[PDB]
Amino acid sequence: SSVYITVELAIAVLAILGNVLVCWAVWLNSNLQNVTNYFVVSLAAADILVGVLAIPFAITISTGFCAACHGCLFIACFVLVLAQSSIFSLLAIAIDRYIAIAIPLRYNGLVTGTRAAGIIAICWVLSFAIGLTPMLGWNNCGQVACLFEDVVPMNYMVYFNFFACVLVPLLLMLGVYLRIFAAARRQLARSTLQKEVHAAKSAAIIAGLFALCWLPLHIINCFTFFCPDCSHAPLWLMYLAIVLAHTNSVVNPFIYAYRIREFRQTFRKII
Ligand SMILES: Nc1nc(NCCc2ccc(O)cc2)nc2nc(-c3ccco3)nn12
């Protein structure tokens, strides 16, 4: 009840602060202004919105406020566009690291700032289409009361959101990271190579923390759908899963500060 609201507010504040610090650090320092950091600040902007908007939206869904069907769908499905945007950003970082390690010579030619920003724009406009899919159609609406179970079809969340828009990119980026580390093993000039591995491990960890926090919620949703006969998951368990999913937005500034020395130095300069 009140504990859920307090923890959601704390998570929102921490995520907003950390990701604003990350964006300010990237913008302030020319050394950090790489291509991978463009995807990093895209994911940081996704986390910022998760903190500013998605968490209050989840609180409102918890309170069960009444509103119009379209507004209710926007409230319920806003988190999905940000989660998909984060998926696309992590996939972009994985592909960028694969290009940087497997073919370092042609990395500059293949990977350019204009291409990076274009790819970010395409990923952000595709994520909104995927996450807001229940808004246009594929809806279970029939002032409708707001419940994520009611106004959002489980099948869209259990098939389209999870098996296709989440699991497939997650498996692709898993394969990409395993290929990255296999190529790093084959390639072993030594100081430059260990920086790429240290940079690949930094990226591989935030990608893991994402799958660690978001998949519990999706597995609970699948158990709700694939086994209707079994009792619905506990409400406290549901709130805990939501809290775990929203806590992923908080973690990765800490990972950046802990692993990357440049990020820590520019954070200290800002702080
Ligand atoms: N299944 C589900 N439920 C909720 N909230 C409903 C909480 C609830 C659950 C059971 C009940 O009897 C009454 C209320 N939020 C949810 N968010 C998500 C989600 C976000 C991203 C992927 O799944 N799934 N999800």
Counting beta carbons within 10 angstroms of the beta carbon of residue 42, is it exposed (0 to 12), middle (13 to 18) or buried (19 or more)? Answer: buried
Q: Could you say which DSSP state residue 190 is in?
A: H
Q: How far apart are CA 54 and CA 5, in angstroms?
A: 13
Q: How far apart are CA 236 and CA 9, in angstroms?
A: 17
The alpha carbons of the chain give a radius of gyration, in whole angstroms, of 20
66 phi and psi angles, rounded to 5 deg? -95, 140
- CATH of residue 200's domain is 1.20.1070.10
Q: Could you say which DSSP state residue 66 is in?
A: B
Ligand 1 atom having least distance to the Cα of 217? 23
Resolution in angstroms for this experimental structure? 3.3
Q: How far apart are CA 133 and CA 147, in angstroms?
A: 17
Q: Which amino acid is at 7?
A: V
- In the reported structure, the alpha carbon of residue 49 is separated from the centroid of ligand 1 by a whole-number distance in angstroms of 20
The secondary structure of 202-260 as a DSSP string is HHHHHHHHHHHHHHHHHHHHHHHHH-SSSPPPPHHHHHHHHHHHHHHHHHHHHHHHHH-
- Tell me the residue range of the domain where 157 lies: 2-270
Q: Ligand 1 pocket, 232 CB below 6 A? A: yes
First to last CA, the chain: 35
Q: How far apart are CA 196 and CA 144, in angstroms?
A: 52
Residues in a beta bridge with 145: 66
Q: CB count, 10 Å around CB of 130? A: 20
Alpha helices in the chain, H assignment, sequence order = 2-28, 36-49, 55-63, 69-102, 107-110, 113-131, 133-136, 148-151, 154-155, 168-186, 190-226, 235-259, 261-270
Ligand 1 atom having least distance to the Cα of 233? 10
Long-range contacts of 221-226 (CB under 8 A, 24+ apart): 221/154, 221/157, 221/158, 221/162, 222/158, 222/162, 224/154, 224/158, 225/154, 225/155, 225/157, 225/158, 226/158
Residue to substitute in 152, 221, 248 for testing ligand 1 pocket (most ligand atoms within 8 angstroms of CB): 221
Total number of domains constituting the chain: 1
